[PDB]
């Protein structure tokens, strides 16, 4: 859905376990599909943390994480399908085509 991920986003999350008495890694999404496709609707409601994450995994086609007790890099060449809505609610030809998008130029 683009909003509602329990972790830090889609790619991963940190958890504590009392079995081992330590911290383990949870893989929420994009790391599961490695060759298929992923679909994100309501792209403008998605926060900057996942935006920084998809800035890095776009052309990079991978990801990297360094956390308390681990350092590593993952490979995940997936394809994204994003669906967004404007911040004004409606859009016509006479309005400018840049500010209606509500997104940065790096994401374009």
């Amino acid at each position: 859905t683009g909003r509602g991920s329990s972790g830090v986003g889609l790619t991963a999350a940190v958890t504590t376990d009392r079995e081992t008495g330590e911290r383990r890694l949870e893989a929420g999404a994009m790391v599961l599909a490695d060759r298929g496709v992923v679909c994100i609707d309501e792209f403008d409601k998605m926060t900057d943390v996942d935006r920084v994450a998809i800035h890095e995994v776009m052309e990079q086609q991978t990801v990297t994480i360094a956390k308390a007790g681990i350092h590593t890099t993952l490979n995940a060449r997936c394809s994204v399908i994003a669906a967004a809505n404007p911040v004004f609610g409606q859009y016509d030809v006479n309005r400018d085509p840049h500010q209606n998008i509500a997104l940065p130029d790096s994401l374009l």
Binding site: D48, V52, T62, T64, I65, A66, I70, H71, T72, T73, D105
Partner: protein
């Protein structure tokens, strides 16, 4: 208890190793797990250091009833106070009188923890430079100032014992003899882009650095260059930056927003393992 000195070790060099192995420069990715108990010489940068603190080794207890002062030995991070008397006179007695502690007869040690980090060109492709902990004691406590490269030789429980700090001619002469060394070294770096020999020629002069000048009278000027790349989108900008950081050692890629405010300056943070202000 009567130890006036402090015992430490140091390994043999490679020059004494070829002249009739035990001291190899080890990575933290080259630890494997099974080296817990071998003397290892690790090379790396130091980012986190702590203050010098007195850690006790033996706790001294005094009594007024018997006079026999007892000494217990601690090994872990924590301990419990031995309120019960374990002397040689209170065993054959009904009375079991109170004991007190002495902060003067107890032996302490200048303990300090440090976080060694993995070297930049020694890390593999894609991996991140993970850290490791070194616990030092005694006179070595002031030999570790942050912002440097060090070679630490110690046992692996890391209890350091000794620290130090900092075919080829054919490879340089065949690069020289081809002619037009400056333009060849300019057009050799980053060839996946188009043109811009002048910008990247100044990038060549930027990564070669220059000469640091010291007047010897308490004044140091910079011997460095700082280059701006102001441009419009359409031409590649991150590729030249990535090629400069991939070719040059210790190149660190940064960003504009995020944790950048704490990613450009020291950030106070509590430490859970040792529980303190790091």
């Amino acid at each position: 208890l009567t130890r006036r000195y402090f015992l430490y070790f140091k390994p043999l060099s490679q020059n004494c190793a070829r002249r009739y192995i035990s001291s190899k420069p080890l990575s933290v990715r080259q630890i494997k797990g099974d080296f817990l108990g071998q003397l290892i010489t690790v090379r790396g940068i130091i980012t986190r250091v702590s203050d010098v603190k007195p850690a006790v080794e033996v706790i001294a207890y005094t009594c007024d009833q018997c006079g026999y002062e007892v000494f217990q030995e601690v090994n872990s991070r924590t301990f419990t106070p031995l309120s019960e008397c374990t002397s040689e006179e209170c065993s054959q007695n009904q009375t079991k009188g109170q004991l007190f502690m002495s902060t003067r007869a107890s032996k302490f040690s200048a303990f300090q923890e440090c976080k060694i980090q993995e070297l930049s060109q020694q890390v593999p492709v894609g991996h991140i430079p993970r850290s490791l902990n070194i616990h030092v004691n005694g006179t070595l406590v002031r030999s570790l100032s942050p912002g440097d490269i060090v070679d630490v030789t110690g046992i692996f429980l890391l209890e350091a014992q000794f620290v130090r700090q900092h075919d080829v001619e054919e490879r340089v002469m065949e690069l020289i003899t081809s002619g037009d060394v400056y333009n060849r070294l300019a057009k050799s770096i980053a060839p996946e882009i188009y043109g811009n020999l002048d910008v990247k020629k100044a990038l060549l002069l930027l990564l070669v650095g220059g000469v640091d000048k010291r007047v010897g009278d308490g004044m140091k000027i910079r011997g460095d260059i700082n280059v701006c790349l102001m441009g419009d989108p359409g031409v590649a900008k991150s590729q030249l930056l990535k090629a400069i950081c991939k070719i040059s050692p210790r190149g660190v890629y940064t960003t504009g927003k995020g944790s950048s405010g704490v990613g450009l300056t020291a950030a106070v943070m509590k430490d859970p393992v040792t529980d303190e202000m790091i």
